[PDB]
């Protein structure tokens, strides 16, 4: 299964993941593509926020899906 991740800048990156893959795993993959910390990245599906501890299957995401990227702002 493959999914497309778009960002607020207007950029799109293809990503290959399975329904059992966790969001946290996806965060690390994004860090490799962008070079941005995974904590500072937010993934949304159908305009709904996504939890790192939750899996793709939890949000009922099938093949060919679009996810939007947002930036987390925290002082750690």
């Amino acid at each position: 299964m493959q999914i497309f991740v778009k960002t607020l800048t207007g950029k799109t990156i293809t990503l290959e993941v399975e329904p059992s893959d966790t969001i946290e795993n996806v965060k690390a993959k994004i860090q490799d593509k962008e070079g941005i910390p995974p904590d500072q990245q937010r993934l949304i599906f159908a305009g709904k926020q996504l939890e790192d501890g939750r899996t793709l299957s939890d949000y009922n995401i099938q093949k060919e899906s679009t996810l939007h990227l947002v930036l987390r702002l925290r002082g750690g």
């Binding site: 070079g35 910390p37 702002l73 925290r74 002082g75 750690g76």
Partner: protein, 186 residues
């Protein structure tokens, strides 16, 4: 060559011109360029520190060394690059990463470690690696842009060592900087 800036240079090429690409050999050459520049600047900065009797190296020492190594046009632009990098670093409030806080593609933290490892000085500042890092990124982008122009002249979209060498020899400014450096010759 010692470090792995092949990935970093690739990113610069994408922002400067997505159409034009770079060969794997060309990337390696750029890596050696970074190492060569680092050594020359590092030694020059260390000498300045001794003159000022300052163990800790700062942006001020690097700034003087940068101007001496870079031609007139390049030197002026270099000042804005390093100065802004320091300002951006200082401007950022929340950020635990040196590179992220500075906003530089090249590993800012790695540069700081290299300066200390070189045993040039007992202590190294934070604004110094940031300043130097900004200069290195500028040089990388400038070389790639010039190479693209030569590539277009040769009806080629990909950048090769021949293009890189041609671009350097096409401008006296870079030639002076690389006067003591040979890309590849018998």
């Amino acid at each position: 060559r010692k470090e792995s800036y092949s990935i970093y240079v690739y990113k610069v090429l994408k922002q400067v011109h997505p159409d034009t690409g770079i060969s794997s050999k060309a990337m390696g050459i750029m890596n050696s360029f970074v190492n060569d520049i680092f050594e020359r600047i590092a030694g020059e900065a260390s000498r300045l520190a001794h003159y000022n009797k300052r163990s800790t190296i700062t942006s001020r020492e690097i700034q003087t060394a940068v101007r001496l190594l870079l031609p007139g046009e390049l030197a002026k632009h270099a000042v804005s690059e390093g100065t802004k990098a320091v300002t951006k670093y200082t401007s950022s409030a929340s950020a635990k990463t040196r590179s992220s806080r500075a906003g530089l593609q090249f590993p800012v933290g790695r540069v700081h470690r290299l300066l200390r490892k070189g045993n040039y000085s007992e202590r190294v500042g934070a604004g110094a690696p940031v300043y130097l890092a900004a200069v290195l990124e500028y040089l990388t982008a400038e070389i790639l842009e010039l190479a693209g122009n030569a590539a277009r002249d040769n009806k080629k979209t990909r950048i090769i060592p021949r293009h890189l060498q041609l671009a350097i020899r096409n401008d006296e400014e870079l030639n002076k900087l690389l006067g003591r450096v040979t890309i590849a010759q018998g």
